[PDB]
Amino acid sequence: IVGGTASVRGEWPWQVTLHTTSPTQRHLCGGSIIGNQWILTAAHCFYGVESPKILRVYSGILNQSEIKEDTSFFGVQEIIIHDQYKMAESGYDIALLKLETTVGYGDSQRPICLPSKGDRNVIYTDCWVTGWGYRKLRDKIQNTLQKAKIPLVTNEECQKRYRGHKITHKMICAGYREGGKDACKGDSGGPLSCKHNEVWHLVGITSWGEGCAQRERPGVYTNVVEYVDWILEKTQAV
Ligand SMILES: COC(=O)Nc1ccc(-c2cc([C@H](C[C@H]3CCCN(C(C)=O)C3)NC(=O)/C=C/c3cc(Cl)ccc3-n3cnnn3)nnc2Cl)cc1
After folding, report:
1. 93 part of the active site
2. Disulfide connectivity?
């Protein structure tokens, strides 16, 4: 996160840190708890991930230093990638992780609500991007979960900023015209959380951008409201 501040413990209980154990264990991506055995993340996170057996999901974490050999985690049973996913820049950058065990909800870990299909028209005024990512292009993973309030940007305005790309309605952009606050390397997969009528909604999944927090270069997120039925299809399967 560029131009963000340290989070307080329990501020974002749906945020998880997805680790890989191959070749050595490290933070790979962010993710959001959306159900008791479901993590919603970005499909691009699994480039060269051949098996869910090398994945570890840590919930209820503020600081990466809370994670040692003896810290409990959730194993991943299945990685579900959207069928139309090719690359982050083309959209469909969404995936579900089906956990091996059930998440017990509490003050440190609980699910975030998906946006309402009816709320496709509502304008979110209080949106925050979170993660343990870099605070500039050439940096390292941050120990403390960072947060940054960012304004949403219209599709038309985002399309102007990304000449050469096709900014679809399955993407949602966020950023300041002057830059300074954004997601960066290590934040992808994580949430773009918007508070509307005292309830937080998972409005976006951190996906891509040209550099980090550059002026007139909004961050590009998967527009979660457009995948609610896809999510239900995979999580409510008979
Ligand atoms: C000790 O542990 C560690 O150091 N762990 C560690 C783990 C992963 C990384 C990491 C992650 C990423 C991921 C994609 C990759 C995610 C993992 C899988 N993958 C590939 C290519 O293997 C894609 N992208 C973002 O996080 C956000 C993009 C982004 C998003 C927005 Cl909205 C705006 C601007 C953005 N950006 C523009 N330019 N930069 N950002 N990219 N590079 C690196 Cl090196 C670095 C360190």
Report:
1. yes
2. 29-45, 127-194, 158-173, 184-212
Strands (DSSP E) contained in the chain are 5-6, 15-20, 26-35, 38-41, 55-58, 74-81, 95-99, 127-131, 146-149, 152-153, 171-174, 191-196, 199-208, 219-223
**CA gap 40, 192 in Å, rounded:** 12
Q: What is the resolution of this structure in A?
A: 2.3
* No. of helices (H) and no. of strands (E), the chain: 2, 14
Domains in the chain, start-ordered, CATH in brackets?
1-12+112-226 (no CATH), 13-111+227-238 (2.40.10.10)
Residue 47 assigned ligand-binding role: no
187: annotated active-site residue: no
Residue at token pair 């990685």: 79
CA dist., res. 159 & res. 168, Å (int):
8
